[PDB]
């Protein structure tokens, strides 16, 4: 069907893309980067994250595939030498799709702006002190003082979340996970410390105490927001879909990336 | 209906129990500690854990309630001054039940023994070095060397799991969480470090490498097991049921126990 | 002798300052904010840090005293109600001095700039990815990828260092302590993880890998540095001196600020 | 002079020992395992720790050397292929000695018993709950509830201490470091959390609250102590001496064992 291919842009990835397009030319496959049904990302996890954000308005009619030309690749779990086999299997269809949960971030002012994250959304101050009230389903939970906060999807838990001490969650769990960045805890200031895991339909609201300017990141797109009244997190209703051609379990992916390969 | 009441055994809890039995005597309520449908625990979380294990063969036909006579009480979320109101509301019924997930531990030898946990199951060595192979759904994930491992239920995540760096999970999530106790990590020895969160139907198997004697705890019942071939963890099919008379959200309970009250 | 008094600037601190100046007027004491031998700080630890940086060129001929008008005060360990007693005892002299170690930061370009820290010096990137080579006494120790690094004095270990997982060190130990901010650790990227404690005369050098713009903080004075070739840390030869009138041990200060008071 | 050689006891180490004894036979060197001046350990760090405890009454007249026949070896920093060169250089003398600090543990009852540690001393309960009052220089600092406590020497900081979150300290610093094992922290129970670093002459006393039976380990020699009134820690006046023939800096040793080699 309709497909497109993004590339990290180095020689290796560009030529792989050109060879895959040539192999696709031998089947009933049309290159269309406006309304593809298949998005192939060639590069690393950064390249894959860009492909997701490029098509985040047609997530429900798209299956993603990642090919890793360098190292790691939690999302890009295909090797370049298997590109010919991928073309052939993907051309013949008959593949199953798997779906990972997404995170919805809403930023209110004094209008509304919403974002979708595949890894995480983080909040930090505008250079001054970061102080926010953390409100869980309209219940004031804690006043956070520190460097910032990170809300991760399940597939994002192996990324920034992991570096902050968070737990690794299997992506079949529809949840989001909040981790602290360097909170103050003395006799006067008090946070929970532990990462927090939230189910679907729970809403986590960050509300400013004094300064209302914040740096908000969504999958490493980092934007300064001014005059912020509230930042709201919830598990999205939308999901990302992966074309899956082989069994490559999440815990094996974890083993391969952090333990050994 | 049929009910019973356990007590921590100090003067305060015993007299509260005797006064509640007297108040129940004024309704169609029968004291039966063989087949109760309502189990009231008067004491702390330890007392409540004992009540759960006392009736763990009739979990599906029992609703539990906890009254805290001292401090904390994550499970015992009723104050003693509200005992009269509890009797009256519980006598009139018309209460909703809420269900928390449980953890199943299977210990194999060279027969099989199974246990149910409301907080967690932990494994440590018999005094020597603890070394186990961690196998996730029949896939070898890591060789663990250290003091031990802890597998927590969701409601258990605020207990031992929390002290080990684990995340706090809302009990509506059907999952179990594995945390490490003091693992060795150098050039030769390698674990994941992070807590791991597993969905229903995932099986985590611990398999001995050399020594096969282990200390296995289930909710602080600690038993030396000899000639162990495998320890298997999975989210149980059984659930604990709480009689709920008021809204007391999990995250408020967390706030009250760790942040302030 | 010569003395001056800084104030946090709120009503409480200003009037305390004016009353102490009036009490000093009754002794052989001269208000001199150019070459004081005694510097009194009235406010919190921020106020005290400003007093230290205001006089950091005459550290060897100055004894500092802090009065805390609000909460905490690890450096400002005097209560406002004891201001009259402080004036009297300080006017009569006969006090012992205690000295805490300091941290020297050198920033090289492509000239040299040096700074003194009482709490810590931290390094972060200019908004992009932070990557530095960590070189210990001219030996390449690790390539750090993450949010940043923090080098703390001993008295600074209860501040930012503590929030980053660092150890609390008694200030009689002449040392500096390096902590990581959220480092990446996978199969490709590798840091030590643990805080590192360095003796006098050890030199820790941070050397850029790609980007050479960094945000460098010295006691929460945060300055963007461009064209950086090296950041060097070592225990300073200079020391801060406190006028001490009573026994208030460091570990009691720690107990009072973090455990209870 | 007088020397002896301990072996891990496998074929590799025994034959290396026999070949080194043969090479020593060609110089003015006498095998004496009663009053050696040189103790060579052939094996791993466990073997080296046994050699230290075997001669801990003559520490001041002995220089230790370790040869690692397997992996790691923080104390045994010689490779087997350099055994001939070691014999020759050690026979000709003209080597410098380096000294590492030691930890003194005193256990009081209701008599006194003292121990020396090269890595650490740890305390755990006798199977029940571990509760101790932590007293620093006769000042009550905290009541600890949890799995146990670990007091490390500087060279011990890369061992158990590291797995507990402690900082790595250069062995030229005369200090000991206290780390917690899984402490409870809620509204009722409160510890400092952070590792604590103590200078020479500071005394840390553990005092029982209820149960007075404890498992006390000194360099992995673990002994059940009954009727304990106090456990006292201080930096020892004694030191271990290493024969050093080459420059092998501590931070390079750390790099080689944890980062890469
Ligand atoms: N490009 C500059 C940010 S880089 O320098 O930290 N590199 C990112 C590294 O991660 C890997 N990665 C990614 C990715 C990616 C693209 O970057 C943006 C992402 O970078 C993360 N990030 C930011 N600051 C971090 C930090 N201090 N520590 C750890 N990660 C950090 C954050 O998640 C963000 O979305 N998603 C996952 C995943 N799902 N599972 C496991 N690993 C993952 C990626 O393969 C690379 O190794
Ligand atoms: N009795 C001797 C073990 S006591 O000394 O550590 N006390 C237990 C403490 O905890 C609280 N608690 C419990 C409970 C209980 C009954 O103990 C058995 C349980 O004690 C836990 N435990 C063992 N070693 C621990 C340690 N080092 N740190 C922390 N907890 C530890 C473990 O979970 C076990 O099931 N379940 C939860 C819960 N669901 N949420 C939040 N808090 C909870 C309880 O209120 C008390 O404060
Ligand atoms: N003003 C905005 C930064 S504030 O919002 O984090 N507040 C600082 C807090 O700390 C206390 N404090 C200070 C102080 C001070 C003045 O700030 C500048 C300092 O703020 C520290 N800081 C920055 N980001 C932090 C973070 N995420 N977590 C913890 N501390 C952080 C950093 O050390 C810097 O020098 N020195 C020490 C000390 N010696 N012992 C124990 N406590 C200390 C101070 O009493 C206050 O409670
Ligand atoms: N034999 C059973 C205990 S073994 O299974 O944990 N193995 C010990 C491991 O360590 C290394 N090691 C040693 C050593 C040794 C001999 O064991 C006794 C020591 O084992 C330590 N130990 C106990 N439980 C631990 C745990 N959970 N995590 C980490 N270490 C633990 C404890 O320090 C004790 O003295 N001193 C240091 C050092 N100075 N620098 C760096 N590494 C060091 C050694 O090379 C080996 O890799």
Whether C183 sits inside 8 A of A163 (CB atoms) is yes
B151/B233 Cα distance (integer angstroms): 8
SS3 B38: strand
The tokens describing D140, both together, are 């009550």
Check if B251 contacts A (Cβ < 8 Å). yes
> Which segments within chain D are labelled E, that is strand?
2-7, 30-31, 38-43, 63-68, 96-108, 112-117, 120-125, 130-136, 139-152, 168-169, 175-183, 196-199, 204-208, 214-218, 221-225, 230-244
DSSP state, B28?
S
**Position in ligand 4 atom list of the atom nearest CA B131:** 5
Nearest 5°: phi and psi at A85?
Answer: -70, -35
**Position in ligand 1 atom list of the atom nearest CA A71:** 45
Give yes or no: residues A184 and A212 share one domain.
Answer: yes
Alpha-carbon distance A182 to nearest alpha carbon in chain C (angstroms): 5
Helix segments in chain D, DSSP class H: 11-24, 45-54, 83-91, 160-163, 250-254
Q: Is C160 in the pocket of ligand 3 (CB under 6 A)?
A: yes
Residue linked to tokens 């791993």: D44
C223/C203 Cα distance (integer angstroms): 22
Contacts of A222 in chain C (CB under 8 A): 127
- How do C175-183 and C63-68 pair as beta strands? unpaired
**For residue B134, which of B103, B180, B173, B176 has the smallest C-alpha distance?**
B180
- Work out the number of other CB atoms within 10 angstroms of the CB of residue D203: 15
Domain tally, chain C = 2
Whether A257 sits inside 8 A of C185 (CB atoms) is no
Residues 160-179 of chain A with CB under 8 A from chain C are 160, 163-164
Q: In sequence order, what are the residues at sequence separation of 6 or more whose Cβ sits closer than 8 angstroms to the Cβ of residue B213?
A: B125, B126, B224, B225, B226, B227, B228
Contacts of D183 in chain B (CB under 8 A): 163
C257/C251 Cα distance (integer angstroms): 10
Alpha-carbon distance B19 to nearest alpha carbon in chain A (angstroms): 35
Alpha-carbon distance D198 to nearest alpha carbon in chain C (angstroms): 6
What is the DSSP annotation of chain C? -EEEEEE-SSHHHHHHHHHHHHHHTTSS-EE-SSS-SEEEEEESHHHHHHHHHHTTTSGGG-EEEEEESSS--SS----GGGHHHHHHHHHT---EEEEEEEEEEEEE---EEEEEESSEEEEEESSS-EEEEEEETTEEEEEEEEEEEEEE-SGGGGTHHHHTTPPEE-TTS-EEEEEEEEE--SSS-----S-EEEETT--EEEEESS---EEEEETTEEEEE-S--EEEEEEEEEEEEEEE-S---HHHHHIIIII--
Cα separations in angstroms, B4 against A104, B37, C213: 46, 8, 69
Name the residue among C190, C197, C254 with its Cβ closest to that of D168. Answer: C197
B124/B131 Cα distance (integer angstroms): 9
Nearest 5°: phi and psi at A185?
Answer: -135, 105
D190/C4 Cα distance (integer angstroms): 40
The tokens describing B18, both together, are 């005797």
Give yes or no: residues D190 and D210 share one domain.
Answer: yes
Cα separations in angstroms, B72 against B7, B249, D20, D209: 16, 15, 64, 21
Residues A230, A222 contacting (CB under 8 angstroms): no
Contacts of B185 in chain D (CB under 8 A): 163, 258
Check if C152 contacts D (Cβ < 8 Å). no
Contacts of A127 in chain C (CB under 8 A): 222
Name the residue among B163, B164, B188 with its Cβ closest to that of D72. Answer: B188
Give yes or no: residues B45 and B119 share one domain.
Answer: no
Whether C167 sits inside 8 A of D196 (CB atoms) is yes
The tokens describing A70, both together, are 């360098």
Check if C205 contacts D (Cβ < 8 Å). no
Give yes or no: residues A109 and A121 share one domain.
Answer: yes
Residues A75, A47 contacting (CB under 8 angstroms): no
D127/B127 Cα distance (integer angstroms): 11
**For residue B131, which of B194, B203, B206 has the smallest C-alpha distance?**
B206
- Ligand 3, atom 25, lies closest to the CA of C160
Domain span including residue B204: 102-237
Q: What radius of gyration, in Å, describes the C-alpha atoms of chain C?
A: 20
Nearest 5°: phi and psi at B21?
Answer: -60, -40
Maximum CA extent, chain D: 70
B254/B260 Cα distance (integer angstroms): 9
Q: Which amino acids bring their CB within 6 angstroms of ligand 1?
A: A 44-46, 49, 72, 74, 119-120, 155-156, 158-160, 163, 219-220; C 129, 145-147, 182, 184
What is the DSSP annotation of chain A? -EEEEEE-SSHHHHHHHHHHHHHHTTSS-EE-SSS-SEEEEEESHHHHHHHHHHTTTSGGG-EEEEEESSS--SS----GGGHHHHHHHHHT---EEEEEEEEEEEEE---EEEEEESSEEEEEESSS-EEEEEEETTEEEEEEEEEEEEEE-SGGGGTHHHHTTPPEE-TTS-EEEEEEEEE--SSS-----S-EEEETT--EEEEESS---EEEEETTEEEEE-S--EEEEEEEEEEEEEEE-S---HHHHHIIIII--
The tokens describing D110, both together, are 């209701």
Q: Is B45 a catalytic residue?
A: yes
Which burial class, exposed, middle or buried, applies to A13 when counting CB atoms under 10 A from its CB (0-12, 13-18, 19+)? buried
- How do D38-43 and D2-7 pair as beta strands? parallel
Residue linked to tokens 């190292």: A71
**For residue A204, which of A184, A180, A220, A225 has the smallest C-alpha distance?**
A180
**For residue D232, which of D197, D203, D201, D199 has the smallest C-alpha distance?**
D203
D15/D21 Cα distance (integer angstroms): 10
Residues B84, B23 contacting (CB under 8 angstroms): yes
Nearest 5°: phi and psi at C6?
Answer: -95, 155
Residues D19, D12 contacting (CB under 8 angstroms): no
Q: Tell me if B186 is assigned to a ligand binding site.
A: no
Give yes or no: residues C125 and C83 share one domain.
Answer: no
- Work out the number of other CB atoms within 10 angstroms of the CB of residue D77: 20
Q: In sequence order, what are the residues at sequence separation of 6 or more whose Cβ sits closer than 8 angstroms to the Cβ of residue A57?
A: none
Q: Tell me if D193 is assigned to a ligand binding site.
A: no
Name the residue among C173, C191, C198 with its Cβ closest to that of D199. Answer: C173
Check if B187 contacts D (Cβ < 8 Å). yes
Name the residue among A72, A127, A186 with its Cβ closest to that of C257. Answer: A186
Check if A250 contacts B (Cβ < 8 Å). no
* Residue among B32, B45, B138, B256 flagged as catalytic: B45
Q: In sequence order, what are the residues at sequence separation of 6 or more whose Cβ sits closer than 8 angstroms to the Cβ of residue D163?
A: B146, B182, B183, B184, B185
C62/C48 Cα distance (integer angstroms): 14
The tokens describing D170, both together, are 């250069």
> Looking at the DSSP assignment, which residues form a beta bridge with residue A114?
A106
- Work out the number of other CB atoms within 10 angstroms of the CB of residue D26: 10
Give yes or no: residues A113 and A93 share one domain.
Answer: no
Query: Which of B184, B191, B193 should be mutated for ligand 4, with most atoms under 8 A from CB?
Result: B184
Give yes or no: residues A250 and A174 share one domain.
Answer: no
Give yes or no: residues C221 and C127 share one domain.
Answer: yes
Residues D152, D146 contacting (CB under 8 angstroms): no
Resolution in A: 2.0
Give yes or no: residues A222 and A256 share one domain.
Answer: no
- Work out the number of other CB atoms within 10 angstroms of the CB of residue D187: 13
Residues C135, C207 contacting (CB under 8 angstroms): yes
- Ligand 4, atom 23, lies closest to the CA of D160
Give yes or no: residues D30 and D126 share one domain.
Answer: no
Residues constituting chain B: 261
- Among D187, D193, D221, D253, the residue to mutate for chain B (most B Cβ within 10 A): D187
Q: Is B74 in the pocket of ligand 2 (CB under 6 A)?
A: yes
> Which segments within chain B are labelled E, that is strand?
2-7, 30-31, 38-43, 63-68, 96-108, 112-117, 120-125, 130-136, 139-152, 168-169, 175-183, 196-199, 204-208, 214-218, 221-225, 230-244
Helix (H) or strand (E) holding B87: helix B83-91
Cα separations in angstroms, D236 against C152, D115, D168, D203, D240: 27, 10, 19, 11, 10
Give residue A231 CA to ligand 3 midpoint distance, Å. 25
Neighbours of chain B (3+ CB pairs under 8 A): A, D
Residues D66, D73 contacting (CB under 8 angstroms): yes
Q: Is B219 in the pocket of ligand 2 (CB under 6 A)?
A: yes
SS3 B56: coil
Give yes or no: residues A77 and A19 share one domain.
Answer: yes
Residue linked to tokens 């737990």: A167
**For residue A23, which of A70, A71, A73, A84 has the smallest C-alpha distance?**
A84
Give yes or no: residues C231 and C107 share one domain.
Answer: yes
């Amino acid at each position: 069907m309709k497909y497109m291919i993004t590339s990290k842009g180095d020689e290796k990835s560009d030529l792989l893309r050109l060879n895959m397009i040539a192999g696709f030319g031998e089947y009933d496959m049309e290159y269309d980067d406006v309304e593809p049904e298949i998005v192939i990302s060639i590069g690393g996890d950064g390249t894959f994250l860009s492909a997701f954000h490029q098509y985040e308005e047609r997530l429900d009619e798209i299956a993603f595939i990642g090919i890793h030309t360098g190292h790691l690749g939690f999302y890009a779990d295909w090797r370049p030498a298997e590109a010919d086999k991928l073309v052939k299997l993907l051309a013949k269809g008959e593949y199953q799709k798997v779906s990972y949960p997404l995170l919805k971030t809403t930023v209110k002012y004094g209008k509304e702006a919403t974002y979708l994250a595949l890894n995480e959304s983080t909040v930090k101050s505008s250079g001054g002190p970061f102080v926010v009230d953390v409100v869980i389903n309209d219940i004031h939970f804690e006043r956070f003082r520190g460097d910032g906060l990170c809300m991760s999807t399940p597939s994002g838990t192996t990324a920034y979340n992991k570096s902050l001490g968070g737990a690794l969650m299997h992506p079949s769990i529809e949840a989001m996970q909040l981790t602290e960045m360097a909170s103050i805890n003395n006799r006067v200031y008090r946070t929970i410390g532990s990462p927090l895991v939230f189910p679907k339909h729970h809403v986590v609201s960050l509300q400013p105490v004094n300064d209302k300017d914040f740096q908000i990141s969504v999958d490493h797109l980092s934007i300064l927001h001014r005059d912020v009244q509230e930042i709201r997190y919830e598990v999205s209703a939308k999901k990302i879909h992966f074309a899956r051609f082989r069994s490559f379990p999440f815990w094996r992916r974890v083993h391969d990336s952090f333990i050994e390969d």
